[model samples]
Target chain A: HWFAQAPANIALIKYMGKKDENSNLPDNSSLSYTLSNLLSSVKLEKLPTKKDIWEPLTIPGAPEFNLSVEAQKRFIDHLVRLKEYFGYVGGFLIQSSNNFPHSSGLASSASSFAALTKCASIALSELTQKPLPSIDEQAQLSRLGSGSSCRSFYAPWALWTGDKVSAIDLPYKDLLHQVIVISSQEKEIPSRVAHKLVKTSPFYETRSERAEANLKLLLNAFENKDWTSIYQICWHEFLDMHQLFKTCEKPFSYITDNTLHILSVIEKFWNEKGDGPVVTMDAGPNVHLLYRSDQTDLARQFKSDHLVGNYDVL
Target chain B: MHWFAQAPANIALIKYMGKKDENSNLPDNSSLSYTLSNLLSSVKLEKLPTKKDIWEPLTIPGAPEFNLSVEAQKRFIDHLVRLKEYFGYVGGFLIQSSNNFPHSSGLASSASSFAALTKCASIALSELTQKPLPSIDEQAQLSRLGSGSSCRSFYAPWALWTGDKVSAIDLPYKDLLHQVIVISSQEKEIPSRVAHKLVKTSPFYETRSERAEANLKLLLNAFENKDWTSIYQICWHEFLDMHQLFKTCEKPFSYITDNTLHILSVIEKFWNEKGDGPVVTMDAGPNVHLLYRSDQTDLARQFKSDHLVGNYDVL
Candidate 1:
């Protein structure tokens, strides 16, 4: 048996649009951090059946999750291609699970496919006499599964510059990550649809350029470890993206009253007080609070006072 | 003969910008507007026995505020000379003008000032020549010669101005409650004058006239159908389009302040919660103007009471 687990991630500069869907090449560059707490683990076991089996992910308390016919077909096709690339006769059953709840509005796929790559990569290793691919090579192989999943193979910091993905460290210190789970329900619109929808906006012409500029500003802030500057850039960048959502031809927004209420609380706090948290979001309505490690008490206080029932603290 | 004319400042729901003909002062696109009741411009003109012309600022029981400027006198004098020649008016004399609000406070005093002067000139020529004056439509065309947007002031609450024609669109918007949210009373650091020139430098400016035109068409349809949400969406889109012109220009500017953004976010969140609220828009200046049905009177004032400061000025 072979087992592997990988960390989930939250994109600070999110990858929104795609240049080409064939290889999942992104329209803009992005920077993200792999979550140290949340994870998706994959396990590989030899099966005695005539054909290989695809086992969907499971959570103990919640109902098991299954990939769609096409998604699963694609996953099996990818595995088939992976073994075909290497010299192997398939005789394996692949299964997956997550420490987090299924469909919790958290992106489990990044870590799931990432964990699958490593798990299956090693499982297929016994069929070969050669050493495993280099870590960089492993990351590239991960890209064949999905764009964001490749980022999970990275650590601390991942910067994808349209050309390639690389792991690099910044001078930032005393940083901690937390997520205020606004809703556990599945998102109304998937990121796949939203990405394609963004291309229709007139603002889409300038979105990539703006993302590039914001990335430079983010790097500068991280180089100096400036919380306020980072917060400002992240705030404007996400809002700019959401503005596209609201202004598109067939307009739709991810924001809700709960999202706004939480945002208003944080905004007023930062305006009155000093730097507290650098907030960002993905394709969903949850708020990702990246804050200083030392201010854990105050951050917890913010959660205690304003928070309802659920959260993921790190 | 002595004649007086007064006109209220009108804010464009669809802003008119750029110029096709500088001499005629014609706009690059058609626009629609709604008048503001409190802010006004008044002019009094009298014929003189001698040929000399005089200019003076009249008091409105308020301080001179901020309407005084250098270039206005020159433009006014030139406009006066053109009207004199066009109307075959020989005598010239004292003219007094007054404004109730500060300049560049999103109040284009020139629109009111020029519109009043056009009417002032028309009345004098009509009485002196004992000839019938031009119709309001003709007067509107003449007012446009002085300032592109001046034509709208004559049509009052709801006006549509195009290169082809200028006329009032009959509607019930006059009963709408208007609240002015003034974040700052300071004169514009970047005046609308500079903004007009800088607009062409924006990459988005090329497509702006088209957006203004589309929004005006949507606004007119909404007005005719009495669709509040449709009107709200169009109004929001049009104002933000102009603001985007300011933001994306080569120099890159934002008349909206931090407090202004915070206020807007609050209002936007209110909209998300209620699914109904005032339609927000702004001029080239920083102040915000909100228009909603009188049914929203309680809701609007509630918003003002909670989030607003002593700065709320009703118009």
Candidate 2:
């Protein structure tokens, strides 16, 4: 049996639109920070029986995190591709589990896919003469399943530009992270639909040009360790995408009334102290807060007073 | 060329986003108005003898070049023919229109353009038929046949529109300044003409007519009392009502851009910081229009220097 583990990644400079639909090529480059605490681990064992068997992911402390029927088929198809790539022949038994706290506010697709890719590489490499795939090769394979999963293979920071995923080294690494959960249910429209619907906005014409300009400034701030500039850039980047959701042809909003209230409460603190967390969201109703370790005291105050109870915090 | 009339654009405090009747083009509900002084459209008319009426947009120095779109040219020619036939005239005319503002600044040059055109056409009909020129009320009535909001441009400072007639309302506030922030000078993707028809497809529209009637009553009181904060709250929601119809329509359309939203965000935050700053509103284009009193010029100076410098053309 070979066991593997991988963490999820969240984008600070978001990748919102797709330049090519079939291949999932993005319109612009994106930068992300990997969340080390929330993780997925998978185990692969060789079975003497003739057919492959798959089981739902579960940890001792968690429930059975089952995938939908279509998702199970999707995973099976991806595993078949991996088997062909490795040129290994055998019946397989696979099981997976997550360290997630049954967190409904965040997505686990990236973590699950990245762990599956890692587990398959080690399991198949031992059964055949082929050596294990390199880190670059692993990332490319993960991307075939889900685009953001490629970034999860790299620790700390990753940049996805065109066809390649590369890691970026930084001098400092003591940033605090937290998730303000709004709902535990699934989104009505998926991320792929969001990727396609963004093009219909009248503002879509100049979005790529503006995104590139924002990314340039963000990289410059990263080199200088400018947390304030990073906060501004992150806020501006997410708002631009959400505006697309509001202005699309058939408008769909993940921002609910409670989401707006949470933001307003956060802004009041930021205006007064100027050391509040960087507030942003993905294509969902929940908010993600990233801040410097120096602001940990204020972050806790925000958590106690404003953020809803029972969601995990860092 | 010297014989012409000029009129300025108007803003809808209570916007008429749709119509109840297609033929007469009567609005869904009545509305309150605000007129402009800077952006003017002027029309020059000359009677001709070709058994045809010709009309075109005039070009001016340092302003955007103007041309009649296919839909615009069709409506202009048809309306001109109707006016001549009503007056029982035998000859044709040549009409050219020029605007002092940018062609597609999203300020509804349609209202001002038709205001000047109807005025210009009415006098030309008088010269041919040798009858007294119609009253201002009659001209306002005739203006609606060409453009629905054109009737509101006939009066000064403020006016009202309904199925019955258009009339002026006297208010004490005449020193209000308007600074239109142009996000782009190009023509908008969707026209207000289509916007009127598209709004009917909106789920938010079921209450728009009834809701607009209530807002008009509030705005009337707010305008009469010269209360900035009251008018601010009333007009903000009123503009949003017109906008959401586009977002929630059967096939949605949006005229605003990222630039429009970024500035609007800054404006809202600015207002929260300073309780009595300029309040923002927008039309069917990407441009944002801000309204403030003469004493509040200091706020404009601060906002423009800190927020708007080098990013946009504010006029």
Candidate 3:
């Protein structure tokens, strides 16, 4: 069996502010992506009980800690549910590694879960002599393990398939031209507290209503291939989301100057050129730019000026 | 025939920023009102003078002397039109008035001219028609001749009509719910030049687009029917407009004061009581209003307790 690593996806459609936590339903649909470059693979060959500790069989750059007991328990529960729901089962020894830096706020844990889920599902399919799983089935298994992980399950585009709040739906990965990460050397506020505070904000209701309306308009614009409308909606949505944070009573959080400055530079350049792409940020401050696929040169020039860590996808 | 004196009104709509001047045949749709009550007239008929001693008379109210042009050509032209339009003749005796006090803000001369025009129009209308003419018609005529806003001669809600920008929009008198006039005990920048400078330097241009749209919506709601939405829109629109003015440029024009303290106090008190209204102003300076309709008792109480003027309208 092959082990794979995945980079956790941050969501622009925030999965925070959920009405129900158990079912993992969100007030809005979230989308994210697994970064392949941010992943590391580990192959494990278990030496039967006679192994003298196997010399700490290791994967390069893998964190020393074994997967957490809590993670393992959750994974087991998911496994049981998958068997009951989809009638599939399998056993495999797999090891994985996440490439996210310490305190990167990239949801590395979720990424690892997705990678493990992908590995386990593939193993199960092979053992059962079941027809090789389609892309949607593979994506579903990854989503069961972690909502954001669903983003990584698909190659170009992924849709998280669940209706509960914060559930992922109809990913638009191909539309994104580049992501400019603004790394933080600090830990994020505990997610639970931040999520609760954001939900209680009076502006939350306004944002929810607007987000849904915008989503429909956006989808239609994408369908008709109306580039201008798409750009306008994207810009508007970003403003609305930002405004929501601004009005939040005891505002929850925001990205720091390191990231916001880069965004501003891009805006200034675009204005100078009399044209450019739209930048949207996920729950965290780091941003992704959705530009014309043809404007690769603009992205390169922008990345160079910002001195962003990498522009692999671009 | 009865004669009445009417002062030239310079009713100021403090924040009346944009002008649709020419469309309404007006030059600048600035906020200035004619003070109707200040003008005075006393009429008495003397035995007819034989040699047409139209007796150019002199009168004084106080320090400054008032004069009417000897050959009131504009008045003459107006009378010619009146005569040609209606089968009538025009004749007038000396009409004079004096300034009650030193008219400081460059308004004295204009005020005197308007008073003379009013007197001339009143007498001419009486002589031309065997039937006595109502003061309204004379005031309307004087308004056209004396000054664009002279029509406010009647105590009706005054509106400044625009000339060209957007077809004939008038500044309705009721727009000013309660006005606090600032007595400039001291002199500063000239009003005319300062106003021009402000338009150029201020971000008033950019912010006003949003203000205008909001204003239009409020006006439409008010026109359709008086409802909470209409009232709220008007209040919010005016509040935001004034706030925008403050944020523009470094060290914004300040007329704010301890008296202006009532804005927040009233807002908070009403918010506590779940009441709503808007505080807006026409011009920049010290005076402000916490505008609300007459029926909002909670608002009225807050205004009264806080020493704010209440302006009530019938409609």
Candidate 4:
């Protein structure tokens, strides 16, 4: 039996549309930072049976409450491909749990698939008496489950293109991300459905081109540890993604007015201080405020002063 | 001459940002706006007792007061001088103006105020000369000189103000009402005129122009088809796009507050529940103006009672 843990990631440069519908390849490159204290753990045990079927067990107190048969089938399908690669025809028992709620727009799949891929790879290595696949290979394996899942394999930062992966080292180690939860309700339209709908936007092609260019700028900013450039790039990416979402054929927006309010508060803080925290939102309304340890007091002060009444800072 | 006229405010379904020629006040892109009956400014002008400079004769009745400096007097004289163009040289006049709604909180006070002023001034000119008044188009052009957005207020129901004027007269025009939600009475750190200058600092300025044009197209199509959802979507998009411009600039804006957002969510909830209700739009401040037909008055009232009374003043 092999067990592994993986943390969820927040994309600074967002991932939106897909390039290949069949392969789940992203239309543009994205950069993300692995989150702390939000994780998914998975365990795998190989059975003696020749049949390639995995019995999936979600713990009672797991982040996800219900186990859908469709989800089970998808997991089994992912294992089948891994089985074929490792030349193993045995069954297995897979147990998965998460610290964060599933499908809450917090990128649970990223963490879940990352942990699952790690555990599955380790189990296969044990059964075949072969060394575990490299982190790059592990990332490749994770992509089979979910595209963003590949990002969680390389922490504290990872750059994901359709064909490549680059792990980034943080120049400022004490940087912390404070998440403000505006809404914990499940998304009405799933992100997968939203991704499929992106092509409906008239600016879809332009967005792809701009995102690619922005990715290069983001990488340079990261290398130089330029906070202003980093914030500007991230802010634009977030807004661009939301704008495209709004312009879809049957337009949908996950960002609520609460999301706008949080952004406004951040903007107000920054305007007054000349410099402070920057914010990025995922596919949902919750805001992830990125600031250094030096500004941690400011972040907390902002939360207490502005957001304490209606929001919770996590 | 004793002349009085009232003109309501107009909320842009498609926002206008930049000016083509500063002196002319011609917009770079065309914009469509809905004229609301609820918000209006009434202007009353009476001939002065003696020959004082035209600016010194203007008085505050119930609205804003102005102590005329030379620069202020010069601008007031400009209006009188234009009035003189039609009615011939009238010595001096006293002007009193008042509004039915709040000011400085995202309501287009300038638009309504200028529209009322232009209408009253034109009426005064007409009465003094005993001749025909300026056309609505001429009134609109004159209003543009005072405030660009005020041009839309001359036409009722809907108005398209660009290089030319197009009045939208749909069948459902009479049924609409605008509910003003005033979130803040205080003035902003930066006024709209100053904020317009910040557009030069944004890299996204060109993008905003393109969006405004696209939104105008969308709004025109929606009007022709009388598609409510399409109109609502276009209105929200245009406003959000303008707000994004403010956010992306060097000195970022915080125009939309928590109270503003709370109202937006309430609106979204109302929208999701009943397919549609009131659609919201803001100028540059924290106030939210919700537009809906008479049938949705219950929704507006309920929103006012439930969500607005504590946090804001609902007008």
The number of the candidate with the highest lDDT is 2
* DockQ of every candidate structure: 0.01, 0.00, 0.01, 0.01
Candidate 2 clash pair list: none
- Model 2's CAPRI class? incorrect
Model 1 steric clash pairs: none
Chain A alone, TM-score for each of the models? Answer: 0.89, 0.89, 0.68, 0.88
TM-score for candidate 2 (chain B): 0.93
Q: What i-RMS does every model get?
A: 23.8, 21.9, 24.5, 19.7
Tens-place lDDT per residue, model 1, A80-152, is 6667657777567777788874453687767877887888788787657556776676677777776787788
Q: Which lDDT value does model 2 have at B251? A: 92
Question: After best superposition, candidate 3 residue B158: deviation in angstroms?
Answer: 75
Candidate 3: tens digits of C-alpha lDDT, residues B245-264: 55464445544444454554
lDDT per residue (tens digit) for residues B204-268 in model 1:
88888767766776776687687877888888888888888888988888788777888888888
How do all models score by TM-score? 0.47, 0.49, 0.39, 0.48
* All candidates in order of lDDT, best leading: 2, 1, 4, 3
Task: Indicate the TM-score of model 1.
Answer: 0.47
Off by over 4 Å in 4: A21-25, A47-64, A67-70, A101-104, A184-187, B1-315
TM-score of chain A taken by itself, candidate 3: 0.68
What's the lDDT for residue A167 in model 3? 24
> What TM-score, to 2 decimals, does candidate 4 have?
0.48
Best by TM-score: 2
Q: Give the native contact fraction of candidate 4.
A: 0.00
